[PDB]
């Protein structure tokens, strides 16, 4: 399948080269997979989600996304126009308030929630969790992400936006999950992207167009935007039977575009998420 005039990041993940604008992907499109977006919520009524999004948990007075960040990330996973996996099921878990903040204890509870809640959902092709969030190093936060991964969920986490080594941030620094840095449309490391040995992969993160609240769209930047590209890619590949939740991060690294990014520090992987789709 071909989507013309796609967001540059979608085009990038199905291309051997930067500078194109058509997204190519197998029409299965993540059907039968599930992606949890652990964030500020999802505006599930947005036409771009086509009924495939729902809120399953909140820790606040509402499950509404009063911020936009979670809706934007969910749109990159699975919206019809802005999403990687355009037929996945999206599940929202609101661990962040409408200012985008959340206590680590709430974030931990949300991760343990997903590990259990997937047993209440139909996801025959597999389960992914996207965590476009983080803070300072916490062994408890990392352990929660490790448990979620161990339970059979492909966990993708943002590396962080500090232009620093991700070893000092959580859940970015948990080794067993998929830690995602950000790149721009010219295949440069995004100026804000964290780096380091713990990164597994880069995805598009500068000037990413996606859904926003109020039934709108906008373009924003962050490792928060790169992470859902990888989460959606995992769901897409799992639907295709190419990999499993336990091995999808490694498979994405194995099949990535290699050596194409600039300003990657010595010791950080030079790997850009790629679906290897041959139309």
UniProtKB/Swiss-Prot annotation:
Cofactor(s) required, per the database record: Ca(2+)
Domain of life: Eukaryota
GO biological process: proteolysis
Active site: 39 (charge relay system), 69 (charge relay system), 224 (charge relay system)
UniProt keyword terms in alphabetical order: Calcium, Disulfide bond, Hydrolase, Metal-binding, Protease, Serine protease, Signal, Zymogen
Catalytic EC class: hydrolase
Residues reported in the UniProt entry to bind Ca(2+) 1: 175, 177, 200
Sequence positions that bind Ca(2+) 2: 16, 260
A GO cellular component annotation in the UniProt record: extracellular region
Domain called Peptidase S8: residue spans: 7-279
Disulfide bonding pattern of the chain: 34-123, 178-249
A molecular-function term among this protein's GO annotations: serine-type endopeptidase activity
Cofactor binding, per record: Binds 2 calcium ions per subunit.
Catalytic activity annotation: Hydrolysis of keratin, and of other proteins with subtilisin-like specificity. Hydrolyzes peptide amides
E.C. designation(s): 3.4.21.64
Family per similarity comment: Belongs to the peptidase S8 family.
Function recorded in the entry: Hydrolyzes keratin at aromatic and hydrophobic residues.
Protein name, per record: Proteinase K
Gene name tied to this protein: PROK
Range within the parent protein: 106 to 384 of 384
